[PDB]
């Protein structure tokens, strides 16, 4: 259910619990399931859903790598990493419409595995 494990990773950042880069990773790792199992739709879904991320916080980014400086969607948890930082409040804005937008269309090629998404985050 590779559509569910992109709203259960949305959820964690739009939660404020998971930053960039790892929700970029966690959802290349989505990304690259269903590029296998031929699912070439909801890829191109999923990689405009990273672009999205990347852009609004690659340049803001406080430092660089995959160990620090952190950006998180809206608010910075005390558990993120040194220089870690969040979106600007447009930035959250233009993000969120963009994902909202994105997850619309997998939940479209994919309702039952969002659903049960939804069923298990409940």
């Known amino acids: 259910d590779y559509a569910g494990g992109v709203l259960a990773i949305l959820t964690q950042y739009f939660n404020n619990m998971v930053g960039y880069p790892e ?7 989505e990304e690259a399931n269903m590029s296998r199992e031929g699912m070439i739709n909801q890829k191109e879904i999923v990689h405009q859903m990273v672009e999205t991320i990347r852009r609004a916080s690659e340049p803001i980014r406080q430092g660089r790598g995959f160990h620090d400086a952190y950006v998180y969607f809206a608010s910075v948890p005390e558990n993120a990493p040194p220089n870690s930082i969040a979106l600007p409040p447009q930035a959250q804005s233009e993000v969120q419409a963009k994902l909202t937008e994105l997850m619309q269309k997998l939940a479209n090629r994919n309702p039952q595995g969002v659903a049960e998404e939804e069923q298990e985050l409940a």
């Open 23 to 29: 929700v970029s990773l966690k959802l290349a790792g």
